[PDB]
């Protein structure tokens, strides 16, 4: 048995601009910098954690 995974954003639920495609290493969901509110103008140079799991963490 097999598994695919193809990440979308979580807000406009496509999975085009990769390069801006955020993956969470906490969770693994997705989202662009410019679907969050407010919108990331920086792509993180390293590892990328997510608001949710920032939250749950602190
Ligand atoms: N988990 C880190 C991450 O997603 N970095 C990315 N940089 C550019 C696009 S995605
Ligand atoms: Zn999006
Ligand atoms: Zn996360």
């Known amino acids: 048995h097999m598994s695919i995974m193809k990440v979308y954003c979580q807000?406009?639920?496509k999975?085009?601009?990769?390069?801006?495609?955020?993956?969470?290493?906490?969770?693994?969901?997705?989202?662009?910098t410019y679907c969050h509110r407010?919108?990331?103008?920086?792509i993180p140079d390293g590892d990328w954690f997510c608001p949710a799991c920032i939250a749950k963490a602190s």
Do not use: A, S, W
């Not at 999975?15 to 662009?32: P, R, T, Y």
């Not at 407010?38 to 920086?42: A, G, M, W």
């Open 11 to 13: 807000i406009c639920r």
């Open 15 to 32: 999975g085009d601009n990769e390069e801006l495609l955020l993956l969470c290493d906490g969770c693994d969901k997705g989202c662009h």
């Open 38 to 42: 407010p919108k990331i103008t920086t």
